[PDB]
Amino acid sequence: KLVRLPGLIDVHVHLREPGGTHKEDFASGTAAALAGGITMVCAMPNTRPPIIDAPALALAQKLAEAGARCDFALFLGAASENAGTLGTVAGSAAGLKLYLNETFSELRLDSVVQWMEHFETWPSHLPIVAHAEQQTVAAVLMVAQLTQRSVHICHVARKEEILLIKAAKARGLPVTCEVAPHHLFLSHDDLERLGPGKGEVRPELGSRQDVEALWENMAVIDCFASDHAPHTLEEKCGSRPPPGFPGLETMLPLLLTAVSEGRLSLDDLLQRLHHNPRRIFHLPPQEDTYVEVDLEHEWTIPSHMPFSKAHWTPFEGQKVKGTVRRVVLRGEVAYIDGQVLVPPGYGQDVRKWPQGAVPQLP
């Protein structure tokens, strides 16, 4: 007996095209999404070239329309030079992404004044998301208040961060957040097995107390999002390991395992992988789109999942219960039992759909 889920949405993925296609491309990363029960992805802008201007966005749109197998929206990235220049193209993006800490990105921002300039110039009705760790969460919240608008915090990883966000929500402030599976299912206790190269990720793996705090504060977590961040094993284990884990293919199995154990409900999961992504990013419905899962199937995560070009996973050896059996996307069988059945280019840019524009006052 299979359970029918709606089309799940991952608001934080790295698909590496353009410029990093040995790590992943639209075709492989969206194959990984479908096999993970994800029918729509929002792709981050820290590509090569980075998606920080209209020409780069135009290139990325065509690459995605030609390669993606599931539907998508593309983020724009904030830079030290582009505030006030994105107004014509802003509504065509998923949102604007700010990189406020050190990670796998060249998109620095040297001053909180540059953050303020982005919050002041980006259209006020369109999403802003931030990589903002520890005190940076409080700092970007201050900027959001000074400019009288909302902010969404990416990959919340620490007790410190979730409690800060909790306090802000208690004061009625417009902040939402997401949490990635590795910050719920891995911790410092896994660093010995992973080793120092594989274990590199930003935000770093937290303590057991960090993990426990995120679970205890599930009500504060608006979304789950993988932060699928593929790099090859050679890169992860070489002389300058880049931070990040692949995660599209493992996210839903890990979370289904937790549902089966009573750690959260099926509804809690569907709020965080479907309804709340829709409402925070004003992402449209996908007609005739659903995911069939088998909640009884027990299996062990292998050394690499089938699709991501990362060809490794930090969750190797974990026992899970729940698997994706079938995905239907806009009336076509997209995935069955390990076979992707829609070609590169089947996926579409949801921001071009009439129902995918973010509503605004004239």
Place this chain on the structure above:
Amino acid sequence: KLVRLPGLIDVHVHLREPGGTHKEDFASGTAAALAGGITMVCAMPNTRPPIIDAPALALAQKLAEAGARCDFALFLGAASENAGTLGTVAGSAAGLKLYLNETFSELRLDSVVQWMEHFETWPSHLPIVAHAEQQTVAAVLMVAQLTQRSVHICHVARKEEILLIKAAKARGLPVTCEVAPHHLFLSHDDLERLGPGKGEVRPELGSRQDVEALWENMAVIDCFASDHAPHTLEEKCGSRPPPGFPGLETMLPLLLTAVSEGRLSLDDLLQRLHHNPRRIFHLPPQEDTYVEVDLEHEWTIPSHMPFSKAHWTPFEGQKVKGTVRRVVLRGEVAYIDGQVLVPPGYGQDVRKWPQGAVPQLP
């Protein structure tokens, strides 16, 4: 320049059919919905016969399928005799409605033990909503905790209630709520004009401080819902006035006026009349469905709106800015500039759509 909104959802309406069709019927009440920019309604069970058993639900379903012009879901009502009897039909309903205070209903419940029995027997994945005023909010929240599940509070009207819910949300409890337009836009100050018969409503009109508290605590309000509760003028002004206001045709114009004044954003409105109704009640998308509004049109609410058989309104004389110009429902023009263009029976029971079933574990 018109603004395109998604199809709005009203999770709390009284359509009076069966048994009260001089006040409203499915055809007139859903005409009123469309003219108010509402494309899906959830109809309360305090009809004659009340929708408290499978035969009554079967009757109501056929009446709604034949009369409704927009899409709908039907609530079941809790009674003193039906706990544990609704399991076969529960998933076909919008949810289960508990009447916990005195109002226009015969659906009493004499004991909190009966509340507990409903919370214990109703399927745990399906919505429960309550008419629960003042301390009754705290009491039903206690029952929800004892039985380890969620509850949604209907028509929150008082500072006392919104602050209680706020405290519960700060403790991570699974409670949501809605607010009706008359508790945002009318107060004790309007009782002299309305008079004692027209002014009868449950919850009663609040003080200026109650109204101010709901506005100040907008972040706590998950949904707007009209509690469209039509009665004729003769009934409202006769010897035993029933409580309730019609409200489908005035809700969106009143709220658009508030958006235009900067009291809440367009997004705040769309969360509360579209995204949050969807996610709390697991209501499906409506394909090719949207509402076009004119935000500049100023007008004064007349003594009765065109469609509701109530043929009166408590908002008469209020100046509003914003009007519904066009509604498209599932690819057909449903409403233009005062003309309803879909017949009775165009609307469908969204719980019968494959995408309209509430997901559950096997």
